[PDB]
Every structure is written in structure tokens, then in C-alpha cells.
Amino acid sequence: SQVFGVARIYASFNDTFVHVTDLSGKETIARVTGGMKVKADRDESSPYAAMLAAQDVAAKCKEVGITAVHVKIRATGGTRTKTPGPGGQAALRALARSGLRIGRIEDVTPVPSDSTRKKGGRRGRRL
Amino acid sequence: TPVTLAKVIKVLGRTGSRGGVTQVRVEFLEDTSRTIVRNVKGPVRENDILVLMESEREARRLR
Amino acid sequence: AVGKNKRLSKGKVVDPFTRKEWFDIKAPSTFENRNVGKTLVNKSTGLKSASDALKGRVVEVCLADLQGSEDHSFRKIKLRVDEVQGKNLLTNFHGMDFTTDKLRSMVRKWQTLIEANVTVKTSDDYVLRIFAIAFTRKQANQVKRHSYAQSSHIRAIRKVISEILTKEVQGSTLAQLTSKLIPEVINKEIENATKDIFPLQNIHVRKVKLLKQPKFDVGALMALHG
Amino acid sequence: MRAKWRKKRTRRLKRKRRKVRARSK
Amino acid sequence: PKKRASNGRNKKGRGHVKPVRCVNCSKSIPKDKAIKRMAIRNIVEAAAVRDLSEASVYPEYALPKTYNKLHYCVSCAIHARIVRVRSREDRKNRAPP
RNA sequence: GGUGAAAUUCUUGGAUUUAUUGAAGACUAACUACUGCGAAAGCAUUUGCCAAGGACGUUUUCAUUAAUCAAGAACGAAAGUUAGGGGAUCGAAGAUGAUCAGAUACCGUCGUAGUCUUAACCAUAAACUAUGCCGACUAGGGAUCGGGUGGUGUUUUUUUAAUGACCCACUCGGCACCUUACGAGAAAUCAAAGUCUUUGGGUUCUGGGGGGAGUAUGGUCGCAAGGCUGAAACUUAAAGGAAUUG
RNA sequence: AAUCCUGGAUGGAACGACCGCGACCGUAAA
RNA sequence: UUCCUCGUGGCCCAAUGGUCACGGCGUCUGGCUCGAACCAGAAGAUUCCAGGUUCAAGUCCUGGCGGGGAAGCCA
RNA sequence: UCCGAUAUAGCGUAACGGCUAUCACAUCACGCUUUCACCGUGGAGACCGGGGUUCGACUCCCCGUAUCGGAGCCA
Numbered sequence: 008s009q010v011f012g013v014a015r016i017y018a019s020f021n022d023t024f025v026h027v028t029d030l031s032g033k034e035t036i037a038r039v040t041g042g043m044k045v046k047a048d049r050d051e052s053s054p055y056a057a058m059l060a061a062q063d064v065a066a067k068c069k070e071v072g073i074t075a076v077h078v079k080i081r082a083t084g085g086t087r088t089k090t091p092g093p094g095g096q097a098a099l100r101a102l103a104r105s106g107l108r109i110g111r112i113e114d115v116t117p118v119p120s121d122s123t124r125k126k127g128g129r130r131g132r133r134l
Numbered sequence: 135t136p137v138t139l140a141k142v143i144k145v146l147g148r149t150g151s152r153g154g155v156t157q158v159r160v161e162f163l164e165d166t167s168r169t170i171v172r173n174v175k176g177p178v179r180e181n182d183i184l185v186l187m188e189s190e191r192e193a194r195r196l197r
Numbered sequence: 198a199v200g201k202n203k204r205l206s207k208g209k210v211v212d213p214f215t216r217k218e219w220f221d222i223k224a225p226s227t228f229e230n231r232n233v234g235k236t237l238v239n240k241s242t243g244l245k246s247a248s249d250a251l252k253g254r255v256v257e258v259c260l261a262d263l264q265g266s267e268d269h270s271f272r273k274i275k276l277r278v279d280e281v282q283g284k285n286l287l288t289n290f291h292g293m294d295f296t297t298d299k300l301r302s303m304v305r306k307w308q309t310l311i312e313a314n315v316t317v318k319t320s321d322d323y324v325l326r327i328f329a330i331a332f333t334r335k336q337a338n339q340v341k342r343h344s345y346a347q348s349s350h351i352r353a354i355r356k357v358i359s360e361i362l363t364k365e366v367q368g369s370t371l372a373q374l375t376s377k378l379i380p381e382v383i384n385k386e387i388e389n390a391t392k393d394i395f396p397l398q399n400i401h402v403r404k405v406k407l408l409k410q411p412k413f414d415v416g417a418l419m420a421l422h423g
Numbered sequence: 424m425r426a427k428w429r430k431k432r433t434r435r436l437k438r439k440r441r442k443v444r445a446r447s448k
Numbered sequence: 449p450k451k452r453a454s455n456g457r458n459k460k461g462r463g464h465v466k467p468v469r470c471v472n473c474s475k476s477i478p479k480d481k482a483i484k485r486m487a488i489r490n491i492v493e494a495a496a497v498r499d500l501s502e503a504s505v506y507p508e509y510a511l512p513k514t515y516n517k518l519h520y521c522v523s524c525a526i527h528a529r530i531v532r533v534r535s536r537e538d539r540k541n542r543a544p545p
Numbered sequence: 546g547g548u549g550a551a552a553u554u555c556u557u558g559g560a561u562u563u564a565u566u567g568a569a570g571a572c573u574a575a576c577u578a579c580u581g582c583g584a585a586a587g588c589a590u591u592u593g594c595c596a597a598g599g600a601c602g603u604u605u606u607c608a609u610u611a612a613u614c615a616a617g618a619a620c621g622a623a624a625g626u627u628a629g630g631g632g633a634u635c636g637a638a639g640a641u642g643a644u645c646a647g648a649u650a651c652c653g654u655c656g657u658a659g660u661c662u663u664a665a666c667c668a669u670a671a672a673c674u675a676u677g678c679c680g681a682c683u684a685g686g687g688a689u690c691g692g693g694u695g696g697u698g699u700u701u702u703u704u705u706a707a708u709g710a711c712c713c714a715c716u717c718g719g720c721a722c723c724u725u726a727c728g729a730g731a732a733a734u735c736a737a738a739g740u741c742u743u744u745g746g747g748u749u750c751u752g753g754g755g756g757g758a759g760u761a762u763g764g765u766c767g768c769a770a771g772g773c774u775g776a777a778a779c780u781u782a783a784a785g786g787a788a789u790u791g
Numbered sequence: 792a793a794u795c796c797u798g799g800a801u802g803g804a805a806c807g808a809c810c811g812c813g814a815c816c817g818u819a820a821a
Numbered sequence: 822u823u824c825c826u827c828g829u830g831g832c833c834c835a836a837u838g839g840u841c842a843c844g845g846c847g848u849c850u851g852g853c854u855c856g857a858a859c860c861a862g863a864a865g866a867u868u869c870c871a872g873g874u875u876c877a878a879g880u881c882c883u884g885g886c887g888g889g890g891a892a893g894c895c896a
Numbered sequence: 897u898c899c900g901a902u903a904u905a906g907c908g909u910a911a912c913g914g915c916u917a918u919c920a921c922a923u924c925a926c927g928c929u930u931u932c933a934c935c936g937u938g939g940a941g942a943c944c945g946g947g948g949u950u951c952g953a954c955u956c957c958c959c960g961u962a963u964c965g966g967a968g969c970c971a
């Protein structure tokens with residue numbers, strides 16, 4: 008009954024991506040970011056920006072014919088934060104409220120097995 | 135240009151650098167059973183009524 | 198951010214969803230449900246042949262979505278497209294994996310983690326790397342709080358697990374293996390083989406990945422899809 | 424001054440004196 | 449003088465402990481001296497779970513959790529309203545609240 | 546993209562992002578603990594090989610072969626040097642974008658040497674337990690790592706056995722920890738920093754107010770960087786330790 | 792008699808110790 | 822000696838022939854706080870000298886002065 | 897000489913024949929901060945020059961000036 012996509016939220020600090028794909032990931036629909044909905048470079052990571060992005064994405068989804076979506080929430084990962092930014096949960100609640108259906112949230116942040124090397128020096132980012 | 139009525143049911147506490155802002159837990163009159171948290175500027179009570187120009191947003195709670 | 202682009206183009210509208218058609222994904226016969234979902238491609242022009250862009254696709258799907266039960270809820274399955282016959286493209290097993298939530302919930306401290314891997318091949322000339330995991334268990338009547346193993350127990354457990362996996366994959370072709378994995382009988386065999394070494398809770402296996410496929414052999418594929 | 428940097432200064436001085444003496448040696 | 453008998457850390461009988469990096473400032477700190485915390489959190493919120501359950505197919509589901517082990521340096525932990533500072537006597541308190 | 550905010554930077558020649566692969570080199574997450582091994586430095590993926598070691602057990606053997614040790618020797622983090630390889634990441638230098646009164650600093654983006662490895666050098670560190678090694682005695686308490694003993698103990702096997710894993714009691718040897726001070730200490734604190742004016746168990750090293758000074762000079766080692774050894778003139782009444790109230 | 796549940800923070804800048812006289816020099820605090 | 826160039830508020834520098842002349846630093850006044858930094862504001866010019874060209878010359882033309890630079894070669 | 901492009905507020909830049917024309921910077925104020933920077937809201941400001949086509953020219957046609965790039969060159 009339901010036609011499923013994959014939302015693939017990447018909630019970084021400094022930005023948030025919401026962009027839905029087909030079940031395979033090769034075919035993408037409706038990539039929207041927080042910096043497409045605001046004019047600061049300061050609020051690109053804001054929950055409001057993420058919410059508006061998710062709203063536009065859900066609009067395009069129902070324009071195409073997608074009704075449900077699986078969620079893969081992601082942070083920067085690698086050597087970087089590994090914890091998600093503020094605009095992930097907001098986007099999720101937004102595209103839940105908009106009319107889409109949800110199924111099988113997963114957290115897919117790339118985690119290393121003792122990675123190469125973090126940046127900042129051994130003495131840290133100093134401020 | 136739609137707006138939303140919301141009834142206050144619980145005052146949480148003051149907020150802001152200088153104490154001129156208050157947190158409130160409002161319950162929507164229409165679309166009831168929805169309870170969002172909002173910032174408020176002026177003197178506010180429970181059973182007061184606010185007109186949200188934007189309803190799909192929550193304020194960072196302090197607790 | 199919207200108006201911050203100083204130059205959009207280094208030197209100096211058409212909707213693409215009118216150009217696309219849908220395609221239904223069919224799973225093999227070692228799965229209670231066949232209709233996995235739908236996929237998109239562009240209309241097959243005379244020079245692209247959308248089936249070719251669609252052939253080597255991989256789709257990740259929950260084994261709960263394939264079987265009905267929510268006990269197979271973590272247990273992702275990667276299915277690889279192999280053939281197209283009129284809008285019902287057919288898939289085969291490409292790999293298994295766990296969810297990060299399950300792995301992390303399993304991984305607790307004050308218990309010993311045990312990992313094993315084998316790189317065995319099957320009768321159908323598939324080459325698979327199977328990963329097994331286990332965690333030590335704190336017995337009932339136990340008062341000391343950590344329950345670690347003694348690093349020879351770990352090695353013996355790992356030997357047992359590796360030989361069991363090489364024994365159980367040899368003989369299973371690929372679909373026989375999938376039907377062995379879904380009911381989680383490998384875990385029961387590992388538990389019965391290790392209970393004389395160490396308790397070993399949470400003997401869920403781990404991801405499976407394909408390294409080397411044989412040539413296509415459409416017949417064995419269509420033997421699945423009835 | 425920090426002893427590490429006093430030491431570094433003294434070392435650079437010892438080096439310059441080594442070479443100004445190699446001039447004559 | 450000496451402040452702590454462990455001196456800052458948990459290195460009795462090792463010599464060297466193979467540093468880790470702080471999650472905020474990327475400072476190299478020995479793993480024993482680091483502060484380890486474990487931030488386990490439901491993925492969405494306690495607030496949006498109602499909307500998610502209402503808009504969800506597959507009832508009963510789970511709403512799984514997120515797990516990451518946080519390593520902070522001393523400076524960052526003291527700045528972030530963690531192990532803040534204690535009296536000479538309560539410094540010896542080795543338990544949590 | 547980055548930031549507190551930005552800009553440098555990349556972007557309709559499609560950047561960021563998605564999927565599927567491939568290559569390279571590094572690293573060995575989570576498990577990871579007041580836990581382990583090692584003379585220390587140090588050592589965390591699997592498997593195999595090579596040799597080594599401690600503890601325990603022992604109604605085995607030798608029989609004082611021992612302890613500490615000037616001279617002398619092996620090992621010795623990181624950086625650095627020579628030569629090859631390798632060269633992803635990060636990144637002394639350097640270039641840049643900011644901030645700033647200035648900022649050739651902190652922040653950001655790039656980025657050589659280096660970071661890895663082979664064969665040699667160097668021989669330094671808050672190389673710290675800032676506590677030399679050996680030995681005996683002196684207070685309680687519990688936990689833990691390894692070994693061993695005992696228990697009709699629990700569980701699993703094949704109800705059963707032997708095991709293995711747990712529980713109880715005990716013990717040797719470790720990493721440590723809690724409480725107290727008989728005692729010690731200037732105190733902070735210490736089961737050793739105690740058994741020291743009621744002053745002697747054995748033994749090696751080092752210091753004698755602060756600076757000048759780990760400087761100058763001479764030797765010696767080193768490719769070099771530098772290391773080891775190491776004064777004097779002159780100057781000075783205080784430097785310094787631990788605690789106390791502000 | 793019904794009844795499934797939750798806790799959570801970022802953040803710019805912020806130097807110094809004090810005076811006067813055309814000449815060297817002169818004056819000042821606890 | 823020849824040739825080229827420049828001459829501008831106390832300092833550095835700029836200008837369409839077209840307002841008794843842009844900027845920055847310095848100075849002065851007030852403010853913030855004692856001084857710097859910072860916020861506001863003011864003042865200061867016969868554009869090197871002597872001549873001419875145009876309705877108008879800082880500028881357009883000639884000579885002098887001073888500062889700098891290039892050339893001064895074959896023997 | 898040929899081809900192509902460009903000239904737009906103080907600078908730069910964008911545009912459909914149904915607008916004396918949007919934009920970030922410059923400046924005029926109002927705001928916000930202990931102040932400084934950062935930041936937000938309203939303004940006032942311009943289609944290279946001249947002819948032609950058109951219910952309507954920045955825009956199209958012709959000519960000319962200036963600039964850039966590439967090609968060419970018998971007084």
C-alpha cells in the first residue's frame with residue numbers, strides 16, 4: 008500500500024541535509040538544506056531551517072508519489088563529532104507532521120576502528 | 135496568514151539574559167492534546183491565551 | 198547563504214520525473230514476503246538501456262520487513278539486482294548486517310567481547326566472509342561483578358566458532374545458508390559447542406559479505422523466483 | 424623567563440660562539 | 449604540593465596508557481586520565497515520540513537509542529558543567545551521585 | 546564548507562550530498578577496568594612459528610654458589626640526523642583569511658620536513674611513585690589478577706560423570722584500595738616517608754644559602770644537533786617549603 | 792474497571808601602573 | 822654637463838583644467854575609565870618659487886631651485 | 897579590417913518589449929549590545945552617446961566611442 012523512500016538526514020553542525028532517495032539510493036529526490044531556507048550562514052544548523060527543509064522535501068515527495076520513508080540519521084562522524092546536530096530531530100518531527108509515514112529509523116554515523124588522526128594538535132583547539 | 139490559539143496550563147520559569155522572558159507549556163485549544171513549550175515576553179498566567187503565528191516550533195527548555 | 202554565491206558558474210528548467218518509470222523489487226524464495234518496494238529509473242532510451250543502470254543496484258531492507266516478525270528487526274539484508282523481466286526486477290542475496298543500536302546495546306563493559314571471522318567458500322563457488330560475535334555471561338549465583346574470560350578460553354571459543362562456520366557454510370550453497378541464518382540455528386550450535394568453555398550470552402552472529410561471485414547462471418536465480 | 428627558553432637561548436649562543444671561534448681555529 | 453594520590457588519573461602499575469582525543473577540543477589526553485562518560489539517548493526526543501508513533505507504520509516498534517562514549521579533557525569538562533570543582537574533603541569521594 | 550561571527554576555499558565545466566566499486570597508507574575504537582605483562586622505555590585486531598619469563602606446586606637436585614655495587618656494558622618515549630622505500634592522515638617551517646592598537650600568536654584554510662618502514666646514529670625527558678636496591682618486624686578491613694588446596698556446595702553436559710564456569714573457606718605471589726595513627730613528619734600527608742637524640746640490619750648514588758651556572762675553559766663521545774665531565778671572578782640577605790586568615 | 796514508557800550544553804574583544812623640568816636633573820608611597 | 826621624474830595641512834600619499842583640495846597618521850575638544858585603546862566631533866592649505874595660456878588653473882606652457890634616478894662609450 | 901563580448905547607482909553586478917530597473921558593498925537615519933565590532937529595518941541614489949522599428953526599447957536594427965580576446969594585413 009505504501010511507497011517507501013529513504014530520507015537520509017545528515018545533521019551536521021553548521022548545516023543540515025534532508026534528501027530522500029529510493030530504496031536503492033541511486034535515485035534521489037528532493038535534496039534540501041538549511042542554508043537554502045535562511046540568509047545568515049549562522050542558522051544553517053538551526054532547527055527551524057531543518058524544519059522548513061523537511062517540509063519542502065515532503066511536499067516534493069507527495070508530488071512524486073512517495074508516501075512513506077525510512078530514516079537514516081547521520082552525524083559528521085569519522086574523526087569528527089560523532090554526535091548529531093540540532094537539526095536532525097527537528098527535520099524528523101517535521102516530515103512526520105507533514106503527512107509522510109515513517110518506518111525503521113536507524114543511526115548510521117560512520118564510526119571508525121581507531122581512525123587515522125584527529126585535527127587540532129595534541130594540545131587541542133585553543134580558545 | 136493563519137494563526138493558532140493556545141491556552142497556558144503551566145508556567146515553568148523565567149528565561150533570558152535579563153529576566154524579561156518566560157517559558158510556558160501551552161495546550162492548543164483546537165487540535166487539543168498537543169502541548170508545546172514557548173517563550174513569552176510579557177506578564178503571563180496560566181489559563182491565559184496566546185496567538186502563535188507559528189506553531190511548529192519548541193523553545194530550548196531550561197531544566 | 199542563498200544570495201552568497203559570487204559566481205554560480207565557473208565560466209559565465211525540465212522536470213526529470215516525467216522522464217522516469219517505476220520498477221518493483223522482488224526478493225528470492227528464502228523470504229516470506231517478495232514485494233520489497235519500488236525503484237526509479239529513466240525511460241530506456243536507445244543509448245542508455247535503463248536495465249543496465251538498474252542491473253547492479255543494491256537495496257538494503259529489514260529482515261522484519263521480509264519475514265513479518267519484529268524479532269528479525271535489526272538484521273538488515275542487502276539484496277543485489279540481477280535480472281529484469283517487465284517491471285518486476287529480481288534480486289539475490291548480497292549480504293547481511295546488524296544495526297548499530299543492537300551492536301552497541303550488546304557491547305557493555307565488565308564482560309569480555311569475543312570476535313571471530315572466517316573467509317570460506319560455498320558449493321556454488323561463492324566466497325563469503327562470515328563474522329561471529331559473542332559476549333561473556335555472568336552466571337546465576339555469581340557475586341563478582343565483571344565475568345571476564347581468561348584469554349585461552351577466548352582462543353578456544355574462537356577456534357570452535359571458526360570451525361563451526363567453515364563446517365556449516367561448506368555444504369550450504371547460498372540459499373541454504375540464508376535459510377540457516379534466518380532461524381538463528383548457528384547461534385544455537387555455537388552455544389552448545391562453547392557451553393563447556395564459557396557461558397557466552399548474545400551469540401548473535403554478525404554481518405555477512407560477499408567477496409567473489411561466480412558467473413551469472415540465470416537458472417539458479419530463476420529457481421528462486423517462481 | 425621560562426627555563427626552557429632560557430636554555431634555548433643559551434644553546435643558540437653556544438652555537439654562535441662555537442662558530443665565531445672556528446673562524447680562528 | 450601534591451593534590452591527589454592518583455595524581456590525576458588511574459595509572460598504578462602501567463607506565464604508559466596510549467592517549468585518546470577529547471571530543472570537543474581534540475586535545476590528546478591519556479585514556480586513564482580521561483573522564484569517560486556514556487551518552488545514551490533516545491534518537492528523537494521525549495516530545496516528538498508521540499508524533500512519530502502516530503505517523504509510524506509498524507506499530508509496537510521500538511524507537512531505538514543512540515550510544516556514544518564521550519571523552520573530555522579536564523578543561524572542557526570543567527567548562528561544560530561536568531566534574532566542576534570540589535572541596536578538599538569531597539575530592540576523595542569516588543562514587544557518583 | 547568552516548566560525549562566536551566571518552572571510553580565504555570549492556561550486557551550472559554540476560560543488561556539498563546519495564549509491565556502487567577500486568587503490569593507497571596509517572591506526573587497532575567500542576569491549577578498556579583504581580585490570581594484565583615487561584628491567585624500564587613500553588606493550589591492545591586474528592592465526593602460525595621462534596625462543597624467553599614470572600607466580601604457584603613439588604617428601605626433585607646443587608649446595609652458600611649470595612646482597613649492593615666505582616670502572617665497564619646492553620636496552621633506552623618523543624623530537625632530531627644519514628641513506629633507501631613509502632607517503633593516506635595530521636602537520637614544527639611557510640603561505641594565506643581574519644581578529645587585534647599591533648598579532649609574522651591563539652581561530653580558519655592550504656601545506657613542505659616529519660609522522661610509517663628498513664639499515665644505522667643519537668642516549669635525552671615532570672624517562673615521576675618527583676620516594677635507590679636487598680632483608681626483618683610492626684594495625685585492622687574487604688575487594689581484585691594469577692596459581693594451588695579443600696568443601697556430600699550451584700549449574701551445564703550423557704538425570705548422572707571428569708571437566709569448564711560460579712559460590713564458600715584457606716593459602717602463596719602480585720597491581721592497588723578503605724579506615725586509624727601506636728608511630729613518624731615542618732606540615733601537606735605516610736603501613737611506609739614507621740621500628741630514628743631510647744640516635745648503628747647491609748649497601749650504591751647525590752646535596753650543603755640564593756644567583757652567576759649546568760655558564761666559560763679543557764678533555765671525551767657524537768655526522769651534526771648536542772651529550773657526559775665541569776669551575777672562577779663577581780654579586781647578594783634573604784631565595785625557598787608547607788600551611789593560616791584576608 | 793482501563794492503562795506500554797522516557798531528559799539535554801556550546802560561544803568574540805577586555806594593555807598598563809601612574810609625575811615634572813630646555814641641560815644633566817628634580818619630586819613622590821606603604 | 823645632458824636626459825627623465827617629483828615637489829601638496831606637522832608626516833606619508835592621491836587628484837577629470839570645472840567648488841579657496843580626497844584619504845590615513847599626528848594635534849585639539851568632549852565622552853567612556855587614571856592613562857592607552859574606543860565612541861563622537863572640530864581645527865589646520867597661499868598645492869616649491871617667478872612668469873604666461875583659458876570664463877576658470879593644484880593640474881595646461883617656460884625658466885630657476887632643491888630631492889632622486891639613467892648616461893658618461895672606442896681608444 | 898573580420899568575429900565575439902562588455903559598458904548599468906559612488907564600485908561592481910542581474911534582467912523577458914506589459915516599470916525612470918533587483919541586488920552585496922559605499923552612505924542617511926532608526927534599531928540591538930557595558931562599549932567596540934558583528935547584525936536587522938526603511939530610504940535617496942544608475943541602463944556608454946546619437947538615429948530608426950514598434951498599443952510599449954536597458955533590452956531589437958543602424959552608426960560611433962572606449963575596453964578585452966582571437967584572427968587577419970601588397971598603396
Ligand SMILES: [Mg+2]
Pocket residue numbers: 449
Ligand atoms: Mg598549585
Ligand SMILES: [Mg+2]
Pocket residue numbers: 463464
Ligand atoms: Mg612514562
Ligand SMILES: [Mg+2]
Pocket residue numbers: none
Ligand atoms: Mg554530485
Ligand SMILES: [Mg+2]
Pocket residue numbers: 573590
Ligand atoms: Mg579492537
Ligand SMILES: [Mg+2]
Pocket residue numbers: 581
Ligand atoms: Mg587482561
Ligand SMILES: [Mg+2]
Pocket residue numbers: none
Ligand atoms: Mg636527567
Ligand SMILES: [Mg+2]
Pocket residue numbers: none
Ligand atoms: Mg629524578
Ligand SMILES: [Mg+2]
Pocket residue numbers: none
Ligand atoms: Mg621493607
Ligand SMILES: [Mg+2]
Pocket residue numbers: none
Ligand atoms: Mg586467589
Ligand SMILES: [Mg+2]
Pocket residue numbers: none
Ligand atoms: Mg591477595
Ligand SMILES: [Mg+2]
Pocket residue numbers: 719720
Ligand atoms: Mg599484578
Ligand SMILES: [Mg+2]
Pocket residue numbers: 753
Ligand atoms: Mg653550607
Ligand SMILES: [Mg+2]
Pocket residue numbers: none
Ligand atoms: Mg649552593
Ligand SMILES: [Mg+2]
Pocket residue numbers: none
Ligand atoms: Mg606555597
Ligand SMILES: [Mg+2]
Pocket residue numbers: none
Ligand atoms: Mg609600558
Ligand SMILES: [Mg+2]
Pocket residue numbers: none
Ligand atoms: Mg611595564
